[model samples]
Target: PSIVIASAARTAVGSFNGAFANTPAHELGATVISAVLERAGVAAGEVNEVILGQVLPAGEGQNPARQAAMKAGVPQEATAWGMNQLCGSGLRAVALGMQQIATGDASIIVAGGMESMSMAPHCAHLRGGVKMGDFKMIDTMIKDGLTDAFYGYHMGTTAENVAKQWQLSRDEQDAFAVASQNKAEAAQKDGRFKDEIVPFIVKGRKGDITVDADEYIRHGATLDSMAKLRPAFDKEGTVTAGNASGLNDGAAAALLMSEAEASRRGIQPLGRIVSWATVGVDPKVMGTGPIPASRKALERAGWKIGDLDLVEANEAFAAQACAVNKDLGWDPSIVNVNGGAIAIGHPIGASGARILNTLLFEMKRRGARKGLATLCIGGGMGVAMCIESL
Candidate 1:
């Protein structure tokens, strides 16, 4: 059985503790789900299941996927579950949905991811009932979500590791970051994202505010400005806040159905999943995970690097993306033509789905047939998915 993506949508990416500060993660996901179903001309009740990827599930509430499905009008009887694979959670969720359709367990599924780093709560260490009143509040977003469980190091540190090992220069990273901002700014100005983004009103302490555009994009970003920003993870390193993805809040979703089922329903699909792969890499240089993962996906799809018309390699950090592109000998012209996470923002779990959605939209708009979306994960792993326009 083949899995076809009928439609996709995402909320505008907002800076952490910024535009979406008060919106719950489930709410963002629910908005995307409603939009995707409506665009696909499918009733929420027709969805057989919902699989959502979430990293800060605690911030979103228990059973985040169920909450989102219920809010999006999915029937109570529908099976909905959330999964986590760090940064690749969204693509993994989509993969799981494809499996369900392939195995005849489900005919229609809604798959995506959502995250709100702003809402990540603080935790008080109370192991053994807190001896000597030594309890200290810890930011769950940084302590648990951003830090690798196996290695007590920040994600930025891993990027620095890759930059140092790959011999990525500060100028190279700064230039790449500037290009990302430029591409994103151009795309936004040209309304390229209008089709993929669903406007949603956010209620804050002040009042209800409508959010129709990504809030984190820097239209004025330049290499000079980026160079001025100090390194975030290492004092003597090339990794800096300006050259890395912003902590963001957003959600993205795609409606998937078996090809036969979509045809029976007279639905036109945007693309079909042709191949997918996930592979582990060295934790220290986790940024290079996409290299191996993309190779496996291409091998599985029986396609060459030259066969891809478009590529959406998540720009978790400019250094990592540059390393992967260099290693793969990919043409920079075809990769991230509309920019990436560096300029748009990275809401962790939601980014995988967001990038995939962008790739599909751009592929169809460009009259391209094949594209690849790949992202590096925190725990030394990468996820890659190959899609062909219908």
Candidate 2:
């Protein structure tokens, strides 16, 4: 039994400062879905189901997954649902879709993620420090338990904590950031990203933002420039704006078909999801997540870390990536050969599919047998998946 990647497509990662800042989440979702369908050479009517992940689906009429399906020309009768697991939602959708196909529940499925952090809602009015207010209220005093539970701190704070515990320095984090930008820059220069990134058409008042390329490739990033930036979360912290993942807007989707169907239809495999797994951890140290997930994926695939020729560990922060590497005793040289969300852009839900697409392209080019893709989640969770060239 061989699982293969029939088709995949991702939009050019957009900047929070540009067209996507005004675009809707559902719109981005639809565009990516359409791109995948076109690339897969499969009719929308042939799709068995659609699995989508979205974070901050806060806007009205926010059935992003279903809305995008309709936009992509997926049959009205086709089934689609949202799987929201915060930052881990996209990978979760992929995991679920694979399970369904393996269990004989469906053969062909579309799975991915979408997000528009630029369009995230902001507080409209100011509230007093009272117990009640129309705009918002500070219940941390009376409801100390609930507030302390989920709102203990921002993700950047947690990442800073990880950096401190691991003794990562600003220079080290900055180097990782530069490496990310360099990889994405080099990839674009060689047109490696052209195979999967669809031209994202964003309607703007001036004309229209037709973004066919990623916007975050800072071609001008020099070691000197990054060194001057101040830390964003905490003073004396290693995770600076240069080292941290950016707020971005984008969407991505991959079409999955059983090996039999793809071969029967003459669709070549991009690669296959050889194995996958998820794990729970302390939310405070959430960034160390990839350690367990990667181990589990290796166990399921019966392969060791040394056996892998390439790896894509989502660099939510340099601290987490280093910690996971220490735990697994992996070589950093092969990790994130291309820039990750830090230098590229992490559009919440879109990152899993986007990084997986990156790994697939690298695997094909290098003729690598096995590769691993993993990401740490929000609220103490993580996921890892392996792909192998057939």
Candidate 3:
């Protein structure tokens, strides 16, 4: 059975501690699951498996995936689990769903990713009683999620290395940053995200809040504004917060099933999962991971990069995106036409599924046929999946 994405949905990407600070991870997960199931015209009882990706689940309660599935009204018997491949977690969940469908292991699966970076807890490391003196509180988001353990550096360092190796200048990185914001601003003005974002109502510390759109995009961003930013990693480095992905919170989910099942149910597929690939690279320059992953996915799909009509490369950093695009010979004209994580924000685990959501919807808007979604992960890994628009 050929696997297809029957439906996809996403919550508006929220800034760190912004609209969703009080919202729990399970709530966001359930929101997207419910939205996807509704859009797919399938009852929750039909779901056989729920796989949601998460990265900073340290503070989140037990089995958030199972909790979300239940909250979404899936039957108690349906199994659920969580996956963590850092930035690749969400897309990895989609890959798992496709594999299960191919093996007839499950008829219907809700797979996606969710993250609440603002809720990532500080670790007391209360191992063996703490000393009377000041015990250091470790931030899980920084220590566990953001650090490249192998090289003892932050994720930004990898982008810095990529920029240095590729001779990417500060001006070029700033230009990419400005371009992403400009494109994103235009897309927002056109209300292109309306169909993909399911408005979510969450009770916050203040009162009820309705979030229906991304919060980090800088309207009317230009090169002049980007030029004033300081380097985020190395003082001499080119990358900056202005040009890098945001620490965000959001959720994205896809309802997946075999093509035959979708046809029987009279539901049209957003796209067919053509092929997928993941690659391991040196963590010191992990940002380059997308090039090999995209190539392998394209190869398995019996096509080359040129065969794809569109691309969704996660903008982990402007320098990284420029370096990877140059290495892979990808056309800028075909990549992230509506902007990317640099504008939409990266909720770590949720970004892959979010990119898939945006890609599929953008295809609908443009009548495009094929697209590839790729993300560079935190731990020297990357994932790419090709989908044939249906």
Candidate 4:
């Protein structure tokens, strides 16, 4: 038995390098969803559930997904829910939808995630106005969970710590970053993403700008540029702006139909969910969660790592992406064949479905059969899924 994918669509990953830095997150999400429904050739009213992800309230809107759906013209009768799972929230939504279908709870389900890193609110004060030396500060997603769970550190700091623990080097990290940029650029040039992109004709104060593809594809990345940037978390750390995922804005959605439903409706099945898994590790090292999470996904699917033709592991950071590739002994060339969240952007909630759509399209372009999509979540968690083309 396989869970079949009906159709998928994703918004172009916005370059945080400039331009779209001021776009609202809810607008981004809604625009993408509207595009997705259009690509699927199905009315939004046919969707039984809309399970969407967003890590933070990023000031875009309180109910980002719902707002986006309404703005996209989804009907009032359709129920939608906003979810947060730190980084893995979007992927979790995938598994949630699969369960619902497996249980006969839905015939048509819409699931995806979105994020707007460029629009993230800066906290000048810990509590919106508290003094610096007040001995009070709002807890972050990583720190609060790590400390409460006795894990003891923040994620960026933990990533620095992991590099030291794993003996990963600045050179290795740079190499991985280069791979991400090159692969993403190559994929774009080859038109691997055209099938899934939902073009958005954005209306702004100035006028309308139609976006047909991700703007983050930079073909000029070099080792020198990657190494020139300073570390983000620690002075001595290896993660840098060029070597890490930029703050990107985007949204993605998958049109899912049960086998019976698709056949009855005369739609082609893209692929089915073979297995899905999520795992927890020391919260401080959240970036490295994909290693264990991928392992469990493969275990549940009863497939060996070597049997997979492609792996789409989100490049949250160079260190984490490199570590996971090495741990899995995966070919760096084929892994994230298109640039990943690192090179493009990670819209906290929207990335999960975005990457999955990228992976599936790449699989189709290459005529490959088996693929896996995985991501290291914030708060030291990882989520992974296995998909096979029929």
Error (Å) of candidate 1 at residue 212 is: 1.2
lDDT of 3 by residue, 1-390 (tens): 689999999999999999888678889999999999999999999999999999988867888999999999999999999999999999999999888889879999999999999898898867688658888899998888899988888999999999989999999888888889888888988999998999999875567888998998888887877898888889987888898988999999999999999999999899999999999998988998998899999999998778888899999999989988998887899899989889889999899999999999998889899899999987788899999976
TM-score: model 3 vs. ground truth:
0.98
What is the per-residue lDDT of model 2 for residues 1-390, given as tens digits with 9 covering 90 to 100? 555678777888888767577887778778877777777788889888889887766553657788888877889888888877667777778878888788888888899888877776643325544457455444321122111156567677778878888888888878878888888788888988888788888786678868888887788678888899998878867777788887788888788878888889987778788899999888888888888889999999999999998998988877777777778887887888867888778888778888887888778787888999899887777899988877
- CA-only RMSD, every prediction: 1.1, 3.8, 1.1, 3.2
My TM-score estimates for the predictions, one after another, are 0.98, 0.91, 0.98, 0.90
State the C-alpha lDDT per candidate: 0.92, 0.79, 0.91, 0.77
Candidate 4's residue-wise lDDT over 61-121, tens digit each?
A: 5677778777877787777787887678777887887877888887777788876666666
- Model 3: ten consecutive residues of lowest lDDT: 125-134
Q: What is candidate 4's CA lDDT for residue 276?
A: 90
Error of 2 at 55 (Å): 0.7
The runs of at least 3 residues in candidate 1 whose Cα sits more than 4 Å from the true structure, single-residue gaps closed, are 204-206
Pairwise lDDT winner, candidates 1 and 4 = 1
Pick the winner on TM-score between candidates 1 and 2. Answer: 1
Tens digits of per-residue lDDT for model 1, 1-390: 789999999999989899898788999999999999999999998999999998887755679899999999999889899998889999889999999999989988999899989888898746668556456788888876788777888999999998988899999999999999999999999999999999988876668888989989998887789989999998888899999998999999899998887899898899999999999998888889899999999999999999999999999999899999999998899999989999999998899999988998999899999999999999799999999987
